[PDB]
């Protein structure tokens, strides 16, 4: 009973967190990349 039910919990903790790791890379690469577009629009404001 404890052999098959706990060995799958290895792959439970892996799959539900890889769903979470790619969500931060959606956010942290848009809250960083918009600063680039913030900087480039600022340079045109100087001109």
């Amino acid at each position: 009973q404890r052999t098959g039910r706990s060995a799958l919990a290895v792959l439970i903790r892996a799959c539900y967190r890889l769903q979470q790791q790619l969500q931060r890379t959606r956010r942290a690469l848009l809250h960083h990349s918009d600063a680039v577009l913030t900087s480039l629009h600022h340079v045109r404001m100087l001109l």
């Binding site: 890889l18 790619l22 690469l29 960083h32 990349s33 680039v36 340079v43 100087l46 001109l47």
Partner: protein
């Protein structure tokens, strides 16, 4: 009067590019260290 303004504005944003060029030089960096600890994770 306008030349003294128009010249100083052009030399201004010339400096702001190199602040942005060192700022936008991390985009080929910032993609690499986010994918590679997930590729070895799958592999």
């Amino acid at each position: 009067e306008q030349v003294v303004v128009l010249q100083a504005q052009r030399t201004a944003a010339a400096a702001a590019l190199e602040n942005a060029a060192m700022q936008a030089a991390e985009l080929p960096v910032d993609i690499e260290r986010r994918l590679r600890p997930i590729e070895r994770n799958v592999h």
